[PDB]
Ligand binder design. Structure first.
Ligand SMILES: CC1(C)CO[C@@H](CNC(=O)N2CCN(C(=O)c3cccc(O)c3)CC2)CO1
Length: 121
């Protein structure tokens, strides 16, 4: 497909699948802080899947690369705060990241192909 706009609904559907994954439970809403009062002493830019979905629906992503950067930020934040590899949260982040990356690859490739087609002549 050379549809330049198709990534948005593809990302909406992928976020729906991520919300149905039990493994997204730790990452659905902005970090509390009452449970992690030193979170901002480690994490510069909090990110969660609800914030990514609201940013998409507001029309405040221009490309799927920008959405992908924020989703990758969720997993880097979780790694930056994980006190060890043998943490349930860390194992949840790795599985959900693998699922995300498996599904976002086509969405990025199709978008970049469509833009190249748009500027072909
Ligand atoms: C001592 C405690 C209270 C520690 O917390 C429980 C296990 N969970 C974590 O350690 N997390 C830190 C890592 N996370 C995040 O960076 C994150 C990312 C996006 C949104 C979001 O809301 C958090 C998730 C939660 C177990 O008991």
């Amino acid at each position: 497909s050379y549809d330049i706009q198709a990534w948005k609904k593809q990302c909406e559907e992928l976020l729906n699948l991520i919300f149905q994954c039990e493994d997204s439970e730790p990452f659905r809403q902005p970090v509390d802080l009452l449970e992690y009062p030193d979170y901002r002493d480690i994490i510069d830019t909090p990110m969660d899947f609800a914030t990514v979905r609201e940013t998409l629906e507001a029309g405040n992503y221009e490309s799927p690369m920008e959405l992908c950067k924020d989703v990758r930020l969720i997993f880097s934040n979780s790694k930056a705060y994980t006190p060890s590899k043998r943490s349930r949260i860390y194992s949840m982040s790795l599985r959900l990241s693998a699922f995300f990356e498996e599904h976002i690859s086509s969405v990025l490739s199709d978008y970049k192909s469509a833009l190249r087609f748009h500027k072909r002549n």
